[PDB]
Amino acid sequence: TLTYDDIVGTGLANKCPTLDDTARGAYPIDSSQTYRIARLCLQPTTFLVKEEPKNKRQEAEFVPTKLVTRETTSLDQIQGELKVNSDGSLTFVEEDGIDFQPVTVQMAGGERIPLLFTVKNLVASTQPNVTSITTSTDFKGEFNVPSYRTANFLDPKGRGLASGYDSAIALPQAKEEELARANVKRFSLTKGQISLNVAKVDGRTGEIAGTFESEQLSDDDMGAHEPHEVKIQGVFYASIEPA
Amino acid sequence: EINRRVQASLASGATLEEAWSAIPEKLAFYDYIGNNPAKGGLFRTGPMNKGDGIAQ
Amino acid sequence: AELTPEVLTVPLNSEGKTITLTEKQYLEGKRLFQYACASCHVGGITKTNPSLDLRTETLALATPPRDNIEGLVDYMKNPTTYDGEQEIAEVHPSLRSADIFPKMRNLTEKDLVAIAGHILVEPKILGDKWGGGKVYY
Amino acid sequence: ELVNVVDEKLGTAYGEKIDLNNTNIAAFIQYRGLYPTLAKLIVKNAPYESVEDVLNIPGLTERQKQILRENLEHFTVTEVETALVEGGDRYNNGLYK
Numbered sequence A: 001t002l003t004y005d006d007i008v009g010t011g012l013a014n015k016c017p018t019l020d021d022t023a024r025g026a027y028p029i030d031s032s033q034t035y036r037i038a039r040l041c042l043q044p045t046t047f048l049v050k051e052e053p054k055n056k057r058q059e060a061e062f063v064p065t066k067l068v069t070r071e072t073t074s075l076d077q078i079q080g081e082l083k084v085n086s087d088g089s090l091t092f093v094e095e096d097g098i099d100f101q102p103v104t105v106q107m108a109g110g111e112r113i114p115l116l117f118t119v120k121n122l123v124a125s126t127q128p129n130v131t132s133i134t135t136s137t138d139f140k141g142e143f144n145v146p147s148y149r150t151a152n153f154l155d156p157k158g159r160g161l162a163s164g165y166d167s168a169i170a171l172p173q174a175k176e177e178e179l180a181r182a183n184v185k186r187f188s189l190t191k192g193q194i195s196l197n198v199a200k201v202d203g204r205t206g207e208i209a210g211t212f213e214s215e216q217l218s219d220d221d222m223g224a225h226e227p228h229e230v231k232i233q234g235v236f237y238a239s240i241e242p243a
Numbered sequence B: 001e002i003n004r005r006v007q008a009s010l011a012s013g014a015t016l017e018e019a020w021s022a023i024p025e026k027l028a029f030y031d032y033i034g035n036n037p038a039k040g041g042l043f044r045t046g047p048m049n050k051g052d053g054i055a056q
Numbered sequence C: 001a002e003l004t005p006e007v008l009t010v011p012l013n014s015e016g017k018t019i020t021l022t023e024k025q026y027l028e029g030k031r032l033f034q035y036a037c038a039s040c041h042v043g044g045i046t047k048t049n050p051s052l053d054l055r056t057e058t059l060a061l062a063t064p065p066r067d068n069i070e071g072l073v074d075y076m077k078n079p080t081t082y083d084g085e086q087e088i089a090e091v092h093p094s095l096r097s098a099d100i101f102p103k104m105r106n107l108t109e110k111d112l113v114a115i116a117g118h119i120l121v122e123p124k125i126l127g128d129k130w131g132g133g134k135v136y137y
Numbered sequence D: 001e002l003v004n005v006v007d008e009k010l011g012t013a014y015g016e017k018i019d020l021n022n023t024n025i026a027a028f029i030q031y032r033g034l035y036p037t038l039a040k041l042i043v044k045n046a047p048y049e050s051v052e053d054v055l056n057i058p059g060l061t062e063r064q065k066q067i068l069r070e071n072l073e074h075f076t077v078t079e080v081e082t083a084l085v086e087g088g089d090r091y092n093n094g095l096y097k
């Protein structure tokens, strides 16, 4: 098969595995066995940002953006328990993995939108009575979105939350209040929402693949400005295992 | 000098509020680095009031 | 100031016994510490794990206590984590893993005592600078 | 009004004692017997409703429990502060020497 030296520099390392067109099977679930997802992979194909209109009577649309951070976007090696619930629904509870990527996209006109693309602490569920995972199975869930920068991050004048100056030291006698938003760093933690639509299943292997769409807030630069709403779409792949 | 006057005031009975209330504003104002002439810049133009402000 | 007999007098064991080192042992200790240890512990710090330093107070709170000759000699034979729970000979040089840490192969018992002696004497000279890292350069 | 949550935390018991819910793991080196084995376990099994709850960590040897007991006067608990616990910062908070 393909080794690192086959793949290095091709772009494939950012691509989730695909399933053949024959993968249309059913993966049976025994409510007596415990399972895990041994590998969840999410490859974004589109980032959309919701425009923010001047009057809030206009309907705000999600608009296309251009990716400027290259092929560094995919979430992978995610794993966690796949619980079988009382009512036969399945629940994925993320425990670990490469489960975030900082991403920057650009609006028409050049506005750059950094976001922490993520499914940290994902708890996603199916509809009830899932005796088998099929191309009709879906997962819907919620996850956490912590600040895009972590607490040590210092702005360009040295100011920070867990480190840094607490004032604008270049303006030794300016008034503080107008600068409070810039000087007092804050750490956001918000919720995002995701849906995974299975489209392929290899029952013989436990592998599934399909499409996903999530929604989360973008970088608020440690409280300095209002984040935007992002909509991420792409393909996914998962390997389920008895465990 | 401000410390001397405050110590004298006190030595002679004053409360701490009185002793400090006795210090002329003009003397206090000299004891402020915004008036030190070695605190400027070559391209920082105009009156001192244009930096820290007009003292009230 | 001088490197005197008082400066060179250090705890031998956990029970309060001291030992006075000769100036020659001190120098030996400094030399052998450079030869075998300073690549990671230059200045009393630890390059590959900065949480742990060679300060006397730190050594005293290790398990077993390492703030004395005997403790240090034993460390150099059979190093443990700081809580004494684990034997780390496989990734920390010692007489026990002289096969994989070849500079350990010709260290004699007397050499180990000299190094222990260096580690206990330096902070008596350098104070907080020992184990202080760059703040104190 | 906007507040720096870390500075605020320095006003609570987090500023006085090792906080089992927030404090970076290297702080456990300050007492005999805690680091690395108990420190790893304390951080992995956080948060705790009270200091005593640290004794209920599954799998502890008897001397482990005894070391915990001897060090409870040095511990505290406050609410998980997101800014202290995100980014694996309990494991490596970007401070070395």
Ligand code: CLA
Pocket (backbone or CB within 6 Å): B042, B043, B044, B045, B046, B047
């Ligand atoms: C000894 C001369 C002197 C001094 C010490 C002052 C001092 C002062 N003036 Mg007066 N002034 C002067 C002459 C002077 N002035 C003259 C000749 C005029 C008529 C132009 C004025 C008109 C004037 C006005 C209208 C005002 C002042 C004000 C002030 C105050 C602020 C100064 C400032 O911001 O400078 C800043 C100075 C600089 C930024 C220049 C620095 C040096 C330059 C860069 C040299 C250029 C180098 C050159 C390119 C080299 C090339 C050679 C080649 C071969 C390489 C201060 C008390 C201000 C105020 O507060 O008044 C109440 C104000 O409004 N001044």
Ligand code: HEC
Pocket (backbone or CB within 6 Å): C033, C036, C037, C038, C039, C040, C041, C046, C048, C049, C052, C053, C054, C055, C058, C059, C062, C066, C072, C075, C076, C080, C081, C082, C088, C092, C093, C115
């Ligand atoms: C890097 C490759 C090292 C060399 C060379 C030496 N030591 Fe070391 N030391 C190293 C690490 C990563 C650690 C921490 C290990 C752990 O997981 O706990 C240490 C620790 C020590 C200690 C314990 C410190 C304490 O405060 O209790 C001592 C006493 C010590 N090291 C001494 C020592 C001596 C004498 C060496 C020369 C023969 C030596 N070290 C080499 C990394 C490295």
Ligand SMILES: CCCCCCCS[C@@H]1O[C@H](CO)[C@@H](O)[C@H](O)[C@H]1O
Pocket (backbone or CB within 6 Å): C128, C131, C132, D026, D027, D097
């Ligand atoms: C509670 C977590 C804090 C960890 C312990 C503080 C280490 S900070 C400590 O400050 C001292 C200054 O005199 C020095 O002795 C030392 O070199 C320095 O690192």
Ligand SMILES: [Ca+2]
Pocket (backbone or CB within 6 Å): A135, A136, A137, A197, A198, A199
């Ligand atoms: Ca489907």
